[PDB]
Every structure is written in structure tokens, then in C-alpha cells.
Ligand binder design. Structure first.
Ligand SMILES: [Mg+2]
Ligand SMILES: [Mg+2]
Ligand code: NA
Ligand code: NA
Ligand code: NA
Ligand code: NA
Lengths: 409, 204
């Protein structure tokens, strides 16, 4: 508990940029793109207002567009007079991927027509397209193979406070060990994480802060319409914050909260708001109506674990169940607890042989052990129960490929 | 029920079946089958033939059956086991786990085959477990897969009875003969004996 992330003071002009969405769409062979930026304002609407969206590649400006406010006619009452959409043509664009994280810089200038900059916001843009076609997840027309890991925000000394040094160390190590993806288990992360993934190159699964695992049954709250308001904000305010990041390729509705009607409403909400990214969610069977990807946790390669109501089928068997078409990427697999990771190669033989098996997210990155001190003042790695905490699930907090200090297992 | 159309020795296998000048001849072998056998309840699937690749004539005759007799699926293996002329993925000798990634007409792991991007159809091998001589090793591997996978719905073993003929020696004693034993040339020797039973129905 506590104030565990950044605190800041932001001065904004009265007449301001209140929101901006960036999108990239492509011709069949990806040799042409239209960058579409929707900009929104607050304050007094005046004829003299403009928005200039310019697109930079290092120092070279490759595109620019300038328009006044007042969007297209939306419905019978008109349009959004406090909005504008800029559309920039981009020839032969440098594409973004975890392989080559090519980035552009988009500057959004709110200004008077006559050239008085009121204020400017900006972001790194990654020209890339994510779509699921014919049962396969595609980035830029090519089927991905998710070499991923689940990452909790953890530090042995600082707890859940994240810092740049640590975040960089994680990304260096992940990419050094042939990881190309990371799951935000199980909440929106520190803002700097998404920026780093944009720049170094990692496909991100951005996940809402909704976990109700200890409910009986697991979907007791998420099926409850009285809990919809609280849930929606955890989904909507996530999307509103991170939707501009190229590194984020998949949205997640949370983790281990069963399947409730609230998951359906919210799934639809993201599909309606953001057509660019597939929505996934594991609860209630990992193949429900709330997910575009079959995303089981700890489903084995060949062995069925056929629990009533929520079976964990062999991943090979799952794909070809009567009527099923969607891609399979496990949100959690290969529990790296203590001396583990036996049978790992079995997964990767399968991932490769089967097109619609597109990988997984190892559980998990770092051991959640905390530093404690003895009578001589010597540091030691502590787990569940070591702080007088009870009930506790003992050493189950340590399931990482690396120790708390980022030393490799 | 399978039409009397097999053009295996052609190069490439579909030379005749893709040729429109062979469509009348082919049609008579499909259409006269249906007209004869269509009231038999034991017939549950129609087959357009065997090993004749995949040509346009197959698609035509496929549709003819679907138009005349909606009561039965139409299957045909040629041209990759999953063409537009088959309701059932019906590979011959596709292995259980092992892919045989042949050019143009690969034999995928039956388990892999079902979940190929876009594929939804059921899978029943028109031929598997070639029972030639001391054979049927790994038969259990198929039936394990069949039971675990809903859309793997079994297959037809190749085959029931050895094709050996009786020949007599100088003393008049009978012996089982195969390819070659009649001065027949060229021949493919013992490759005609792939049965689960001998020619006289004694079990292997
Ligand atoms: Mg306990
Ligand atoms: Mg010969
Ligand atoms: Na794959
Ligand atoms: Na754990
Ligand atoms: Na079956
Ligand atoms: Na034979």
C-alpha cells in the first residue's frame, strides 16, 4: 500500500489538448500508410484555432497536416466542433516490430492559424498492423510466434515501486534471452515501461486491473451488473492512457475473475473503441465470448486436464475442437517455481509445428522475494510468512526465471 | 461407395481428370453408381474415385452428387486430401504426429491437419496402417488420437485381404503367388499382399 508511483504537477493552457488518438492503416503490401490522428480540445472554441500534426523520422519531417476544429457530421445534431482528424499520407513507411522497432515522432500542435503555438503534445509512433485473419494473429501480414514472459512489477528492496534502471535491466535481460513479448500481469504498468518497449522492441499485452480470484465462484462480482461501473473504469481508463503505444498489441480484460456478463460488455467496448488490437481474456474457460485468442493458463501440450466446466485441453487438441478457429497463445505456461521448466521443449516443438499455436507467456519473470535482515545485519531473501504475515502461501511468490536481484535461474 | 475412376499412373496424376474431354467418361462412372446404389442405407458416403490427382472434372462431379443426393457426404483424397471436391479430409497414410511435408501435396500430422488456418472439416483417413507382411506397428498410436480428438473420426485400414493367387508346382501342390510369378513384367512383386488376412481368410 501507499504512494508507489510518480507524483507530478502539470500546467496546461486553458485552451488545451485534452486527448489525441493515433492510428496507422495500410495497403495490401504495407508500402503505403495513412496516419490518422484524432485530436480533442477543451476551453473556448474559436475560428482561429488549428491543429498541426507533423510526422518526423529523426530530423526529417516526412508528413504534415493542418486543419481547423470541427469534425465531420456524426449524427442528426451535427458533429464534434471541439475535435479534428488529421490524415497524413506516408509512402513506404518504416515498420515497427520487436525485431526492428522503427519509430516515428508525431508532434501535435494546438495553435492559432496565424502561428501562435498554444501548446504541443507528442508521442513515438510505430507503424504496424495487428489483425487476426483465418485463425492466425498477424503483425504486418506475418504470423507471430510469441516468445513471452509474465512480468510483475517487483523489487526486492523497494517492493512495488518501479525505477528506470530496473526496468531497463529487465528488458536487456529478456531480449538477451530471446523473449519478444511481455504480459502486464495483472494491471496497467508504470508509464515508462511502455515507452521502453516501444524503443527496445517488445510486444506488450496490456491488462486491466481486474482480478477477483478469491471469490466463490470466481465470477460472482464480474457477473454482477452492480460491479460494472467499477470494472469499466479499469478497462476504459487503461485504453485511454496506453492506446497510442505501438508496443501494446493486445488488450486484456484482467485475470482470474471467471467469465461474467461484465467481461462481455467490456470486450465489446474495446472492440468498438479500438479496432486495431485484439482483446483477450482467460477467465471462465479461456475460450469464451470475451476473448479473440484462446489463452489458457498451464494447459499441457498433449495431456488433457478435463476439469468440469473449465477444462484445460491439450493445446494441440484445443485448436481443432468442433467449430473452433481462433489462435492459441497461453497467457500463462511453464511455471518456473524453484527447480522447474522441465518439459519446456515440448511446448516449443508444438508451437513451431502448429501454425495456430502462436506461443505463450512464461510464468514468470522475477522471484517475488523480499530482503530481510538478521541479528548480524546480514541480508537474506524472504517469502510468504517471513514478515509475520498469515495466512500466507509460503514460497509460491517465487516462480521466476530470475532471482529478486535479477541473477538468472 | 467409390466410383470406378483411378488414373494413378498418369503424369501428372490429374492429366485426364483435369481434361474436359474425359468428363463424359468420368461422369458415367459417378452418375451410374449413384443411380444404382442410392437406396442402400449402408452407403453413407460417396467417393469420386481414387488416385487421379485433382482436376476440374472432380469439382463438377462433386457438385453433381451434392445436387442429386443431399443425404450423403462426398469424399475424395486426390490432389492433397483437402481439395474443394471433398467434404471430409481423407488423407492416405498421414502419420499421427509426424509431418511428411511433400511438395504440393503434403501429408500433415492428422492432429495438425485439422487445425490448419481455416480448416474446419472432419478427418477420416481413406487409407492407413498399411498391413503389408509383418506390419501394423504403431496402430495404437492412431486409435489413441482418434479417441482424444473429436474431429479425428477414424479411418480405413489398407487393407482387408492379401491379393495372392494360387499356383501349382509339378506335383500339383498349391502355393500362394504374387507379382511376377506368372512371367508378368513389369510387376511390383509382393506389394499386392497388404491384408489383415491371408487370401484364404486365415488371420495375420
Ligand atoms: Mg496459509
Ligand atoms: Mg518390374
Ligand atoms: Na506457430
Ligand atoms: Na505464483
Ligand atoms: Na473421434
Ligand atoms: Na497393394
Amino acid at each position: 500500500s501507499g504512494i508507489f508511483r510518480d507524483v507530478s504537477l502539470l500546467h496546461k493552457p486553458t485552451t488545451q489538448i485534452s486527448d489525441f488518438h493515433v492510428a496507422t492503416r495500410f495497403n495490401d503490401d504495407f508500402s503505403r500508410a495513412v496516419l490518422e490522428a484524432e485530436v480533442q480540445m477543451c476551453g473556448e472554441l474559436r475560428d482561429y484555432l488549428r491543429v498541426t500534426v507533423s510526422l518526423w523520422q529523426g530530423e526529417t519531417q516526412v508528413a504534415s497536416g493542418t486543419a481547423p476544429f470541427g469534425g465531420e457530421i456524426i449524427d442528426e445534431r451535427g458533429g464534434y466542433a471541439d475535435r479534428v482528424t488529421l490524415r497524413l499520407n506516408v509512402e513506404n513507411p518504416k515498420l515497427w516490430s520487436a525485431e526492428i522497432p522503427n519509430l516515428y515522432r508525431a508532434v501535435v500542435e494546438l495553435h492559432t492559424a496565424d502561428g501562435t503555438l498554444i501548446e504541443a503534445e507528442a508521442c513515438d509512433v510505430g507503424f504496424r498492423e495487428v489483425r487476426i485473419e483465418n485463425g492466425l494473429l498477424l503483425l504486418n501480414g506475418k504470423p507471430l510466434l510469441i516468445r513471452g514472459v509474465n512480468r510483475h512489477e517487483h523489487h526486492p528492496l523497494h517492493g512495488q515501486v518501479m525505477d528506470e534502471q530496473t526496468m531497463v535491466q529487465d528488458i536487456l535481460l529478456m531480449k538477451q534471452n530471446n523473449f519478444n513479448a511481455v504480459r502486464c500481469s495483472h494491471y496497467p504498468n508504470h508509464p515508462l515501461w511502455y515507452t521502453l518497449c516501444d524503443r527496445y522492441g517488445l510486444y506488450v499485452v496490456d491488462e486491466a486491473n481486474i482480478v477477483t480470484h478469491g471469490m466463490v465462484p470466481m465470477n460472482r462480482l464480474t457477473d454482477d451488473p452492480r460491479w460494472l461501473p467499477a470494472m469499466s473504469e479499469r478497462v476504459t481508463r487503461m485504453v485511454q492512457r496506453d492506446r497510442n503505444h505501438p508496443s501494446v498489441i493486445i488488450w486484456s480484460l484482467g485475470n482470474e475473475s471467471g467469465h461474467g456478463a461484465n467481461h462481455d460488455a467490456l470486450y465489446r467496448w474495446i472492440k468498438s473503441v479500438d479496432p486495431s488490437r485484439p482483446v483477450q481474456y482467460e477467465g471462465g474457460g479461456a475460450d469464451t465470448t470475451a476473448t479473440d485468442i484462446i489463452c489458457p493458463m498451464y494447459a499441457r501440450v498433449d495431456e488433457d486436464q478435463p476439469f468440469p466446466a473449465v477444462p484445460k485441453w491439450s493445446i494441440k487438441k484445443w485448436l481443432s475442437l468442433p467449430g473452433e478457429t481462433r489462435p492459441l497463445i497461453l497467457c500463462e505456461y511453464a511455471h518456473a517455481m524453484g527447480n522447474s521448466l522441465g518439459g519446456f521443449a515440448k511446448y516449443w516443438q508444438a508451437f513451431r509445428q502448429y501454425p495456430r499455436l502462436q506461443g505463450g507467456f512464461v510464468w514468470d519473470w522475477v522471484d517475488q522475494s523480499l530482503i530481510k535482515y538478521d541479528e548480524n545485519g546480514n541480508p537474506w531473501s524472504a517469502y510468504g510468512g517471513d514478515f509475520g504475515d498469515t495466512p500466507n502461501d509460503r514460497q509460491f511468490c517465487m516462480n521466476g526465471l530470475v532471482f529478486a536481484d535479477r541473477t538468472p535461474h
